[model samples]
Target: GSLTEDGLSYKEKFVVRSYEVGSNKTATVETIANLLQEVGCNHAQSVGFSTDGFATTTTMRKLHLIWVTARMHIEIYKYPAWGDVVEIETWCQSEGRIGTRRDWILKDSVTGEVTGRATSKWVMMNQDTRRLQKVSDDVRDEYLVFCPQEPRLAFPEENNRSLKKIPKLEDPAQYSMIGLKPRRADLDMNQHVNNVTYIGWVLESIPQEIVDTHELQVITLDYRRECQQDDVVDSLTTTTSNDSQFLHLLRLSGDGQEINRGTTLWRKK
Candidate 1:
């Protein structure tokens, strides 16, 4: 049967069948990627795709979808650091020639709790004109039949503003320099360290004292560049008082070249 004629919505099956744990008894990046690929392959009708910005985990999912369906373009927005149990939701909706809209929800797995959510507007485009065209009736009908309904009221809006400037690490005299060696597994198909790996680095760079006592409330990352295999990267951190926050910056330096830069925000536990 054709993908659309199978009488199943990719999103519906994905949310239902993707919760199994692996040998480690934890959800891994590869597992998430496999699930996302299943969704894309089963649907095979999406043209433009947007996702919450690639962190290490979500980026893996995004890349897997791209590999499964090369025709669609994927975009990522910076992800918020809500609790881990929340599952992120995504679906597409449209109104005739007006435009198509995609929405996401982060729901807690244990208690059906909501963490964070977002919505985006996509314009159906004509490959020849490079401009938005109306969504076809057939496409609209299929989506309406398969896609789940989301209530008008959902999670709160995410603050997506970019930081004014990347902060420099402070107190060189007090803090010691710590280094990380990149491994072969760190690299992705793009031939660089995956974006989500950097989040782990940023979290690790902060003083253990802080991570132990405080919870990370927000994180903002800009993908200035990429890092390659066997690269040595430095994680630098600076703490600010008055309101109490930490600014972390991760940089890759080898052969006197600056490879990548990122910043993260944190609050007390």
Candidate 2:
């Protein structure tokens, strides 16, 4: 049986049965996809969705529900690492001429876990205008009937730790550079670089020596911002000797912001 609620304009419920342990003991792409598919199917009326910037859960391939929605779609604006657990939530919380505000939350399910949370703001748009448009009454009515507000965790102030400006590389030779250019096909329904593209960029950024000699056992990424068409991004790779691992920092040159950061743990075969 599903638990139902009706505090907000929408009637929301928790489908506990749909929540299952992911294939990987730890969270993986497949598990995150399953969790989101259930959210999309159950809450089809929702206008937007948001989650922390964890690459595994929010990656393009992992979350197809974003594309199936309306043309304007959703936008993940801020990703802050809280601690161990990943929390994700979605809802259409406002009504206006431009669109609705869909809210999302991703946090640690357990205490002592690092909670990575993000807020996404979405606008329903006129596909033809490519501009914001008022959300239709029907769409708003449908979503309000089913939207539920979960208890929001108090976000930590420290979560706002700003990423440093592009650091000057004292020794260029000490770091490897992976030149990345946005491809025409990389654009999603939103007409921006898709989330999964960053994963590919991270993988491509690794040096051939590491790729050929070691197997990437674990990779974790946080998406900080969005990349649009014709953007030239640079991926910088650095390695630590302790565990045969590599950290790839990805940034967009056009916007002068760090778009994504990931760490890959590798094992020599």
Candidate 3:
């Protein structure tokens, strides 16, 4: 991975490995999500934003603060297969007074054709107190140099509506898988379950038939709370009126508190 020409963005090349491909011989949704996370962290490290605090700079580490993802939206036009070299470009932009945003564009290295686009929003949290915190000017200024004055988005206004907000999945969901526990490896450096683990769980309860015949095209996840390794979770899925779309919810077994809510769209392969 290396910094882009202008130094505002980062780019990396990755060959889809054998293990990363699924039965269809193409990269899986989880593989794509993992690549995005890997590139984002590499970008931060390239800009001297060392992860003493797990994606936070030294100042944020001093404050005992860490970055946590709030939302993520990914749309895949085509999946890269094994032996395919994919180039990914990622950059950060200010989201609001307290949040920051990251965007990514995935391309076929040989043809330069876009294969996918993703965007995510993250906010700071006090690691010790476990409370949301505002980005003080000092903290904001630390990385603002790397962000562009006018940010570019993979999903602009006209196309942004494609990833609409997912509605709350009410009780008595159509399908549910209980006793889903987080494995030790699922925990990230922050000592909480990684966001990518939630994505896999969101699809856990989906019907086998759907998984057999369809390919995932889009997914949107809204992370509501952090899940500890000891916390047990239940994955629930509700069929939408639209045959190709589904609503998902992952909640704690103790109090039924929501950990993550998501929407997924699939298409026939």
Candidate 4:
């Protein structure tokens, strides 16, 4: 990770790989998202200035709830291809008393051309109680000392989503897939499936007809709990009665517990 004189952000470089690409040989939307998560964690661990940060996530676990991603808004200009080296920059700021904000910028490392950008909002919880709680005053105070007190969104005009509801599916057979098995490659340092992998899993289950007709423009995910190696996951999709959007869910195959939920808005292809 690259350090900053301004003491606000941390940046890094990554190369696209053959395994990370989609059929078109460009990095998959899922892979780009994986890089987003990667730089965010790298910066957090590098500059965990408070407790001397994920030594940031580790301390966060010790301090209160883990930093679970609640919502994200990303805009992709073009997906990079295998062997293209790129730069990723990430920073954080306050949202309010109950929440904090994070932003990321992806660009070509060689030419410095902007590639993609994202903004996200996350909230705290009592680890033991598993309930929402306000950020502590001391914690907020420390962040207030950082360079970016109230950083702006990557897209100020087109911001947060209200996230449409995903209805229930009666006939999942018409869908593309039934369930997924997470391999070792899917796990992050946190030892759970990386959050972006869930997005890929959901997309894989969407049937051919829907994909042929629409292109995914916006997506929102609400993570309920972390998924571990022991669990098998099933995916189901419910098409909107209006036929303009798709709602998807990933759940535990064993107990049928809801693991994660998502909604997607699509435009005509």
lDDT of each: 0.43, 0.45, 0.87, 0.70
Candidate 2 C-alpha lDDT tens digits along 98-215: 4444333333444324222222234543333344445555545545544444533213345332212223222342354545888877665546665556666776767777666654
Over all chains combined, what TM-score does candidate 1 have?
0.49
TM-scores for all candidates: the values are 0.49, 0.41, 0.95, 0.79
The window of 10 residues in a row where model 3 has the poorest summed lDDT is 157-166
Q: Give the C-alpha lDDT of model 1.
A: 0.43
Kindly indicate the candidate among 3 and 4 with the higher lDDT: 3
Q: Which of candidates 2 and 3 reaches a greater lDDT?
A: 3
Best by TM-score: 3
Displacement of residue 119 (Cα, Å) in model 4 is 2.1
> Distance from true position, residue 116, model 2, in Å?
19
Query: In model 2, which regions exceed 4 Å deviation?
Result: 1-173, 254-256
Per-residue error for 22 in candidate 1, Å, reads: 17
Q: How well does candidate 2 score on lDDT at residue 67?
A: 21
Evaluate model 3: give its lDDT: 0.87
Name the better of 2 and 3 by TM-score. Answer: 3
* Candidate 2 weakest lDDT stretch, 10 residues: 67-76
Per-residue lDDT for 20-82 in model 3, tens only? Answer: 998899999999999999998898888888643267888987888888888899999999999
After aligning candidate 3 to the native by TM-score, how far in Å is the CA of 247 from where it should be?
Answer: 0.9
Error of 4 at 261 (Å): 2.0
**For model 4, how does the per-residue alpha-carbon lDDT over 132-208 read when each residue is reduced to its tens digit?**
77777766775665547555556655334533343444555345455588898888665667777788887877777
Off by over 4 Å in 3: none
